[PDB]
Amino acid sequence: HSHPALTPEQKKELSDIAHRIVAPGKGILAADESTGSIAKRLQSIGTENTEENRRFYRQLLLTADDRVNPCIGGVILFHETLYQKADDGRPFPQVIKSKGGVVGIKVDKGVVPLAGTNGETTTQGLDGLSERCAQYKKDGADFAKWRCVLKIGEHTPSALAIMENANVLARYASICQQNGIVPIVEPEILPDGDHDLKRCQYVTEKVLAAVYKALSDHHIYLEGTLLKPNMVTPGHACTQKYSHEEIAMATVTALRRTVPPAVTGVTFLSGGQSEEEASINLNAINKCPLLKPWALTFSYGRALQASALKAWGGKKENLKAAQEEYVKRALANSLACQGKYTP
Amino acid sequence: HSHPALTPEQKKELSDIAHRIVAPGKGILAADESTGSIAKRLQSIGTENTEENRRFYRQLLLTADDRVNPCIGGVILFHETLYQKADDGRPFPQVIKSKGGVVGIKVDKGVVPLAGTNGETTTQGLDGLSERCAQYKKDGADFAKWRCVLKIGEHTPSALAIMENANVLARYASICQQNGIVPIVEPEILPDGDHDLKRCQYVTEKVLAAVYKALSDHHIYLEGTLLKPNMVTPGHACTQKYSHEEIAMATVTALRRTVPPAVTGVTFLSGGQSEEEASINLNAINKCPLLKPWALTFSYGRALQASALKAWGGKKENLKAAQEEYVKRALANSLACQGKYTP
Amino acid sequence: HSHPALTPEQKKELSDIAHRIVAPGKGILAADESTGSIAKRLQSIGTENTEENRRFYRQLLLTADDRVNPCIGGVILFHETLYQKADDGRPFPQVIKSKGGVVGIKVDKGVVPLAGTNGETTTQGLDGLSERCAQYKKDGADFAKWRCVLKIGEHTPSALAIMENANVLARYASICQQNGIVPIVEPEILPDGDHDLKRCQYVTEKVLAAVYKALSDHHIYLEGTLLKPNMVTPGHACTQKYSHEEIAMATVTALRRTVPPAVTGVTFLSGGQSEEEASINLNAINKCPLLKPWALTFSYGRALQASALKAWGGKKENLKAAQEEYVKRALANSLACQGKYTP
Amino acid sequence: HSHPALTPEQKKELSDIAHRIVAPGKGILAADESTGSIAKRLQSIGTENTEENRRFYRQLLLTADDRVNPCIGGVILFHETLYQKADDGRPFPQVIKSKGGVVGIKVDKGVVPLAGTNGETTTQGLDGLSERCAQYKKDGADFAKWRCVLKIGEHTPSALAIMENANVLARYASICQQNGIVPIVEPEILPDGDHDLKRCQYVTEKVLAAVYKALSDHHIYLEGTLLKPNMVTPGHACTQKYSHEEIAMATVTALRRTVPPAVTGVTFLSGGQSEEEASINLNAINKCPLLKPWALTFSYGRALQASALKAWGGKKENLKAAQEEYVKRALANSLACQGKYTP
């Protein structure tokens, strides 16, 4: 029976947040890497993984020039970053909002193995998620991020993994929407393996169909959600070479066959692509002649900050230089999400 | 695993047929009523239900002026009509094709009760459907029609009815696409009852989500399919009055939340609406400010031919007059599917 | 909601028929092979496939000694055999009932390919099945047979094939139970391939779980049903040798993990096993020390009549001899279904 | 594909624990009530809800006479009780094991609302459940308890609630079995409402079918699991009176139609029944003439300790008396689970 999960005012709030995140020319800066994840990022540049270094790097990303304001519609933060402060004394959420960007929080608690599967996982983090989301909403976080991991193999992704990940994503989205937080569904399919483009497209279509069936079953307000899928690309070990136009065609075709138009926007992850590769693929996707009812933009981590982290080197004097390496990427992707990028 | 149900050439054929059926300004004339169904239509005008009278009425519909050529993209026929001939000696499929329209065939074999349900039904007709579709393809039928019936009640549509009807529609679509015939999925939700607009929208969203999940599970090529849903309208016994704009908003919202953009077009059924009511509702749907990635047109039976059948009266002398009553409707709906209709 | 598909009297009738079919010491003679299927059986012994030869062979099977009366609880017939007559003038159903056996009819219309799968099939025959079942009930048929075919492969049985076959079996069972006919669900998994015992057990468990979930979803009265599964055996090309006790353990374990106790009985198919092999495997299954709440008996075709067909040779003079070859098998299996067989 | 979740040794361990818990004549003492839940229990007898009072009450339950040793096969504990000590200096798990009983832990973290439903809930507690289960296994807990709550209403239990609760139970069971802990699935259907026996039986059958389908999908080793369902009883507000034999018939029928024989045992919850009512209903269930392949015993909370808590009164001097009130119940239920109870 029609028991409304959300009032019209709650739906208005969620839809407004979702449309603000993915406004034309804008994408998402994925800076939500945890302490353990950022450890290798800092060690790659010879930097000790301390609270001060993480805080300074996040400040570098969040205190860039005003040129990134029309490029960044949202910033995903780790829990620690949400309650950290810039040198000027402003909390990071306030800095993000003053730059005209929405604030999001990573709320998943990592992946856990699924027994009886060939190394497949689901993701945890539903316990106490309502109270956590309420606190994040009070603290300025207006959207949330949740990442499910599927992998292509001889017998994977199996039915169990796809079903469980879709169900978990739907539960997460329901809790976030009940707490006034726009959920970003991220059913990432790993590009590991030697699978070709066609297999990736098939797997992505199946996964997205299951995800949106689960979202329908859980009464999810699609207008107040965002999709963060993998780009349809061959496996890293695949021997067949594919053009950017072919990758864009496969990605847009996979989205058009599974993603309802009510979904506000699609924010692609990079999944190991280089910065230029991610920008070119996003630009080709946005130049695809097919009809794309949703916004197609970026939710980029390494692809927005690899050059910034390289130029920083972990030392204070390189800050400005590193910031430039970030800005030039954001602008680039700001063009890529509009189909106007040219290297 | 990716086992292709269709070759690229088969997909090209199906996509071309689907796009030809629902080309801008064009819709479907639903003239597939069986001998038993047309019995009451002929008795309403005092006409004996004989083969000659049915043949002459179908000829009247199919031999109208050339003004209906840019309005009719497809004509659904009953099995008897497929092998009948006009007075000039042309078989009816040839007449339809010479008018620039695609030929479709009703392939379902009626509804049968679902045990353990509150009067819910599924539909039969899968046995030998492959050979029947092959014969229809040889005989000029390029698309097929299949109608599932759901009804809104206190405990209906139940999970069993929705699941069974979606599965049957997916099986039918798979067989038709294997035989080079574009399937039209018609998950009609009956407007009987006193339910309001919101309940109809909720039920339609659930049904369409289940239908498209089933189509994904059965490897259906969505670009070579068409959707024939009910318009989201209140029950006939509902006391609350709704505007045409509200009906259009609810219908477009229900479609946008469940129908993937890959679907070539949406051809609405009338479900008891009067001719003017159906045209006005279709026009309001096409004037909806929301984004509609698929074509929104008509697949009308009574709403295209009620005035024609009334003006005919079962007598030879009224033919031309009756034809006019048909043409004026087609033109009207040809405007309604473009949002350019004005009574 | 609880909408009763069956009245208590209908349930009583179905339960009584089901318990009569699988009474202790009794099994099913599967003589439902169609004209095309029996063609190779008759050609193996140099016999023309004519109506008279099929009628005489079926009479040979159905007019054996009274020693088969406590061994045969049911006989499955093809449509042609249901309306054929013995030499004495008795219709075959009357002969079967006078021998104390229940009459069943094959109601499925063969297998059809599932598009998008690696050679997987579903089975058709639902159209007009209610009227056919009503006629068969009038004509003396008290149970029905329906066979779904799954096959073990690298990517088979897929989710689509298992789901579709379970749904079709549930629809068939619902129609039969509405017409007062006990349905025998036969989800046969083909022993073709080189898969081992463990893979067959896993596949059988998954298939049976899906089948009984489908039966629950379709409100099937399990007490008025029978299960006809494949024995859990390795593939014919498997190199690993297995004992009879291991086959019995795997089969009983697969049944105990998926088959609700409400199911009246399990009537195993042979699936290519020799007559002695089928009897020994059934005996080992019935000697399994695990708890078996349902009756475990035979529904044998070739394994009950291969020696009879060999001894017959298609000539009139061998009738009695052929009958003996049948009787000795029935008695054997009558012991095997009680765990009292000893070669 | 057959990817073993458990090794044969892990399966042996789980099966041995499960069979030890539900050995003939034995049941489960449910003493896992949290601090908040036991608050009203202690306030009903005028006792302050402090750590010492809870510890002393749990000691009273766990240090009863040796007469309860052949009656108690397992004791469920709250987290606090697992690490509390008796007056003699023995930790409570050691006391339980020395009494010949298995130790279980409540691992669910309470219920949370399901949005879009008529007051339906799921249950949380999966996050970090693997590490928690490993610690509990080290600390002497050999089984775990997880309780899903469904309620019968006009539109409840809906498809979403049943599916989500079954999926959560399957995830919990998989994690517990990976950590060597026997999971007790408790899909409790609340007896609140005015529904009759037939509606409760229908709902219980649907819920159990979904639960065991989910367990099959999650590769759950059924032999190493236990079921803790509600007894099939009418709603508390139902006006129709039912006999104990009718309740037993409905319960056993619901179990026989959905619970595979591989399930080691069924440990019924009380759900508000009085102590004598629960014992009489369990005795009638065990006296049911139907075939019951699994052990049918008790997992009782209030129904084993209400008289003990009443006789205790929160004062030290009543300990022995209170213990007697517990023992007389355990013995009673020890007879009830064998069908040998007589009030």
Numbering used by the authors:
A (entry chain A), B (entry chain D), C (entry chain B), D (entry chain C): 2 to 344
Kindly provide excerpts from the paper associated with this entry.
The Apollo (Direct Electron LP, San Diego, CA USA) is a new high-performance direct detector that addresses these challenges by using a novel event-based MAPS detector custom designed for ultra-fast electron counting. We characterized the physical performance of the camera by measuring the noise power spectrum (NPS), modulation transfer function (MTF), and detective quantum efficiency (DQE). These results were extended by testing the performance of the camera for single particle cryo-EM by collecting data on two common test samples, the 481 kDa apoferritin and 149 kDa aldolase. Finally high-resolution apoferritin and aldolase datasets were collected and reconstructed to 1.66 Å and 2.24 Å respectively. Our results demonstrate that the Apollo camera performs well across a broad range of dose rates and is capable of capturing high quality data that produce high-resolution reconstructions for large and small single particle samples.
In order to see how the camera performed on a more challenging specimen, single particle data were collected on rabbit muscle aldolase, which is a 149 kDa tetramer with D2 symmetry. 722,778 particles of aldolase were collected and processed in cryoSparc. This resulted in a reconstruction at 2.24 Å resolution. The map showed high quality features including clear side chain densities and some high-resolution features such as holes in the middle of six membered rings. The high quality of the map indicates that the Apollo has sufficiently high DQE to reconstruct smaller proteins and complexes with high-fidelity. The Apollo data had a substantially higher ResLog intercept than the other two cameras. The data were collected from a different grid, so they are not directly comparable, but by visual inspection, the grids appeared to be of similar quality judging by ice thickness and monodispersity of particles. Nonetheless, the reconstruction went to substantially higher resolution than the other cameras, and the time to return an 8 k × 8 k super resolution image is around 3 s compared to the DE-64 which is on the order of a minute.
